[PDB]
Design a protein around this ligand. Structure first.
Ligand SMILES: [Zn+2]
Ligand SMILES: [Zn+2]
Lengths: 27, 27, 26, 27
């Protein structure tokens, strides 16, 4: 595995998850 | 669906993702 | 080394998938 | 009301998370 590779991608997962989650909460 | 039930779970998804990401970042 | 983080992320993925399916099928 | 945009985006989030899981268990 490559830890720095997956940190960067999981950070994108987190940001995208949060964006859509917050969108769900304000409709 | 029940939007609150899914928001609750997705909140927990986000929290657990965040703590996994932090753990990875401190290696 | 990172089995515990893998295990945790697996449960994250399962719960995310279940929410996705529940939003479309319930 | 219409959550199609969040469903589409969370599907991509899930795909990226799933590939991270696969890649973390590689090698
Ligand atoms: Zn990178
Ligand atoms: Zn890959």
């Amino acid at each position: 595995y490559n830890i720095q590779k997956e940190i960067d991608r999981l950070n994108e997962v987190a940001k995208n998850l949060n964006e859509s989650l917050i969108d769900l909460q304000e409709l």
